C-alpha cells in the first residue's frame, strides 16, 4: 500500500484544518506531531503560536491550503466524501468565495493582539502571565482588524440565516468552508474574542452553528482538546 | 540526538543542492527518496522532469531548497561542522552572496522543459530523443510554439551572460593562484554555497545538453576546468555521482 504522512504542530491553526479535512474524508493518515511541550526557553505550546507538510507516495505538499486541495483532488473513490462541489457546479463559485474569505482572516494578528492588549479580549483562555512575559503591534492597528472581523462575521451570519427553506453553512453537506469556519471560531474562543462577536444578544445562528460542530464526532475526535492548556 | 529527516526526489535539481550541502557539512541525515523507478504510465526518472523537498528537524518543518539550505547553515554550528558561507561581516560575504543570488535565480525548470520541447536547441543531450516525441487550432498552437521559442532563446542568452561573469571571476582566481598549489573555488579558498549552486547547475546543463554551447573547445576554459574539478570532488561524487546516468534507476 501507499502511506499518507503528515508532519504538523498539533496546535497550529493550519494544521488543525488539515487534520480535520483528513477525518472528514475518512482517510488513513500517519500523523507526526513534531511540537514539544516545553521549549528550550521553557515555554508551553500556548506561548508559541508564531507550515505543515504531506507526503503521499511521490508527492510532497506544503502549506495547509495546498495540502487540502491535494487531498480533495486525489482521493476520489466513491466511498470517500467530497468537501467541495464539482468545479463547474452551480455551487462552487459561492463555496469558494467564502472559503477564500475565511482563509484570508489575519489569525496571526488576532493571536498576537490577544496576548498584547488583552483588554480587548473577554474570557481569554491564555494565562495572564503571557501578556507580562511578552511585553518584555499597536492598538490602533488591532482595533481595525477586529472591526474588519465583525464585518466578515456579519456576512457569515446573514448567509447562515437560511436554515429551513439540518444544513451546514453553504448547503446540506459539510464542506471545506466549514472546516475553515469551525476552526476559525474555536480559535477565536481560545483568544477571548467569542463573547465579543456572538452568544447572548448577538449572532444567534452563528452561536447555534458553533455549538453544533462541537458535538460533531469528527471535530471532537480531532480538535476536542486543542483549547485545553492543561494538555501538551 | 534530534533526527534530521529529508524527503526529496533523488533526481530533482533542488534535492541535489540540499543533499550536497548536507554532505559538505558532514551532517547525519535520514534521507527518504520518495521517487519511484516506474511511474503509473511506466516511465523512468528521465521521462518525468517537472519538485520541492522538505526537511524535518525536531520541531521545524522546512520546505524548498534555498530555505532548507539557509536553515542548515544557521542551525548546525559545532566547531567540527563546516560553514559554507562567510560571516556576515567578512570581506568575502558580499561577493559570495552576490553570486549565490545570481545562480539561484536561473530558471532551471524552464531550461529542462525547453530541452524536452525544442531539442534542436540542445547539443549532445543525455535525455533520450524519444522523451520529446511523446511530449482554427492550427494557427493558435503555432503562435504558442513561437512565443515559447522566443522565451527559451532569451533565457539561454541570459545564461551565457551569467556564465560570462563566472568565467571572469574564475579568471581572477586563476591569476591570484600559483599554478603549483591548492586551487581556489569561485569566491576564495573555501567551498561555499555558491559553489554548490554552481556545481549542480553545471552538471544539470550537461544533462540537458546546454553544455557544449557554454563551455569546451576554447569557450569558457576556466569554467570547463571548474566543472571537471568538481566532478572529482569526493562529496560531489558520493552524492551526485550517478544522477545523470539514465541506466541507473
Author numbering:
A (entry chain B): 23 to 72, 77 to 162, 200 to 228, 236 to 302
B (entry chain A): 23 to 72, 76 to 160, 189 to 302
Text from the published report:
The A247V mutation site resides near the N terminus of helix α7, tightly surrounded by helix α3 and the α6-α7 loop, and having van der Waals contacts to Val121, Tyr124, Cys240, and Thr245. Comparing to the wild-type protein, changes in the crystal structure are small, but an overall movement of surrounding protein segments is caused by the presence of Val in this position, due to the increased volume of the side chain. Both helices α3 and α6 move slightly away, without altering hydrogen-bonding patterns. Ala247 on helix α7 is a central residue of the GDAP1 hydrophobic core. As the most dramatic example, the mutation A247V inside the folded core decreased the stability by 13°C, indicating the importance of a correctly packed hydrophobic core for GDAP1 stability. Ala247 is one of the most conserved residues in the GST superfamily, indicating a role in the GST fold. In GDAP1, Ala247 is so snugly packed that even the addition of two methyl groups in the A247V variant causes protein instability and disease, despite only minor effects in the crystal state. A247V is an example of a mutation introduced into the hydrophobic core that may have long-range effects on the entire protein structure stability. One of the residues in GDAP1 highlighted by the KL divergence analysis, Tyr124, closely interacts with Ala247, indicating a GDAP1-specific arrangement at this site. For Ala247, a mutation into Val is predicted to be slightly stabilising, indicating that such a replacement, in a tightly confined pocket and with potential long-range effects, is difficult for the prediction algorithm.
The ganglioside-induced differentiation-associated protein 1 (GDAP1) is an integral MOM protein, proposed to have an auxiliary role in mitochondrial fission and fusion, possibly via redox-dependent interactions with cytoskeletal components. GDAP1 has two GST-like domains, followed by a transmembrane helix, which anchors the protein into the MOM. Structural data have shown a covalently bound dimer interface in GDAP1, and while dimerisation is a common feature in catalytic GSTs, the GDAP1 dimer is formed differently, with a unique interface having a central disulphide bridge between Cys88 from each subunit. We carried out structural and biophysical analyses on several CMT-linked GDAP1 protein variants and describe new crystal structures of the autosomal recessive R120Q and the autosomal dominant A247V and R282H GDAP1 variants.
